[PDB]
Amino acid sequence: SLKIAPANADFAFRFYYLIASETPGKNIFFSPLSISAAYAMLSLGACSHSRSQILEGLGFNLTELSESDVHRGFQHLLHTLNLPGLETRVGSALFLSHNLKFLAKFLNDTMAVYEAKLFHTNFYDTVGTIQLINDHVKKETRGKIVDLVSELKKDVLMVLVNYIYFKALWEKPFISSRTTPKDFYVDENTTVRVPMMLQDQEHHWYLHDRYLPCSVLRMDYKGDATVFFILPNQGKMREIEEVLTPEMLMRWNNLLRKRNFYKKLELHLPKFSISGSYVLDQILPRLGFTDLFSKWADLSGITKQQKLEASKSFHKATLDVDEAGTEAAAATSFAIKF
Amino acid sequence: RHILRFNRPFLVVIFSTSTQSVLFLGKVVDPTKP
Ligand SMILES: [Cl-]
Ligand code: NA
Numbered sequence A: 001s002l003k004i005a006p007a008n009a010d011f012a013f014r015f016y017y018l019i020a021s022e023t024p025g026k027n028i029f030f031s032p033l034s035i036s037a038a039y040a041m042l043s044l045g046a047c048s049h050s051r052s053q054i055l056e057g058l059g060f061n062l063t064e065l066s067e068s069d070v071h072r073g074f075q076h077l078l079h080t081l082n083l084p085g086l087e088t089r090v091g092s093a094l095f096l097s098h099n100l101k102f103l104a105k106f107l108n109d110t111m112a113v114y115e116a117k118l119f120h121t122n123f124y125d126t127v128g129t130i131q132l133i134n135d136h137v138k139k140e141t142r143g144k145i146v147d148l149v150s151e152l153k154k155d156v157l158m159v160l161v162n163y164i165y166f167k168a169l170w171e172k173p174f175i176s177s178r179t180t181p182k183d184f185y186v187d188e189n190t191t192v193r194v195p196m197m198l199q200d201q202e203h204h205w206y207l208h209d210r211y212l213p214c215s216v217l218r219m220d221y222k223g224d225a226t227v228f229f230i231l232p233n234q235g236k237m238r239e240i241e242e243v244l245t246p247e248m249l250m251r252w253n254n255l256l257r258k259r260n261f262y263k264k265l266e267l268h269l270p271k272f273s274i275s276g277s278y279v280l281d282q283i284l285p286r287l288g289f290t291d292l293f294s295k296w297a298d299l300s301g302i303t304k305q306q307k308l309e310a311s312k313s314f315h316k317a318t319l320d321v322d323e324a325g326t327e328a329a330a331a332t333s334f335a336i337k338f
Numbered sequence B: 001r002h003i004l005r006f007n008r009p010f011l012v013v014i015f016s017t018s019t020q021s022v023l024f025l026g027k028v029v030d031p032t033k034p
Helices: A002-022 A032-043 A048-057 A067-082 A104-114 A126-140 A237-241 A246-255 A280-287
Strands: A028-030 A086-097 A117-121 A156-169 A180-187 A190-199 A203-208 A214-220 A225-232 A262-264 A266-270 A272-279 A314-321 A325-337 B003-005 B010-016 B021-028
Touching: A002 A028, A002 A032, A002 A067, A002 A237, A002 A246, A002 A280, A002 B021, A028 A032, A028 A314, A032 A048, A032 A067, A032 A086, A032 A104, A032 A156, A032 A314, A032 A325, A032 B021, A048 A067, A067 A086, A067 A104, A086 A104, A086 A126, A104 A117, A117 A126, A126 A156, A126 A325, A156 B021, A180 A266, A214 A246, A225 A237, A225 A246, A237 B010, A272 A280, A272 B021, A314 B021, A325 B021
Parallel strands: A086 A117, A266 B003
Antiparallel strands: A028 A272, A028 B021, A086 A156, A156 A325, A180 A190, A190 A266, A203 A214, A203 A262, A214 A225, A225 B010, A272 A314, A314 A325, B010 B021
């Protein structure tokens, strides 16, 4: 899965930067991997220019990587994440119209590469179909992602979905009796109260950046995951966002591989929850996906029976941080109409 | 110098070390909005 890692990280930070620039001063939370895997899966049903353009919008350099390299990369990535103090589950599904004749190759590819489950539903029953899809996503995300599909047009013949569920224990957990309410300074004028967790007996991996107005803490989970908490100096969030790239993440990661930066730390971190909710059909045209959301999209790898077009695409995500660990969940939908 | 207080907006990058993937990315501006 390492061949696709550069493109996936590129897409992650492109998406972040667009949200942060278009809606400043707002909580942001999404799973870039869920979006990438959903759209890569969708691309199995796209033909000709539309296929290449989806993969390009996802950051793939198709002079360096074959389409096979991308899909097999995702297959290995997803298999690895699903393997047995860390729960990660990633899955996919297609909700297929009972009426329409789907191309077996497309169906076969989504099952082989993305482990997709195939479900049949009656899209004449909009209310029932929305409940069926949203209940599946809710179940798979242990209740975290509710109402993924918030709208569903009458002429829809397929909805693609994927989800990610992540629950992981801290290597260095907090003692919950030390958690007390503290001030959190949202901006110059605005202060809220939050439960603030405290640990001060442990060594942690952290640095105060000599080149940028921020500090960086990396906390390990039990299992093969970590989290970087990046703390801009007061009022300097936008300056850090301007340089928030895959290359900057790898700079910080590499600095924090030297035990010079493993030191005793007094850490105050809030216990909190945030979420994100995005309309991808409204956002993604500005990240390379104009073709896919246009009248010109060639989705004729899904069926030859009707001329298909993109309909709504949603992403929702939640983050829950407490003394024991982190829980994060997300899901992405993509509806196809005729 | 040996203290961090996450009491102002901060960024969050959850990273799979086995796959080198950004699993989740975000920013906490106001943690009292779920
Ligand atoms: Cl729709
Ligand atoms: Na670990």
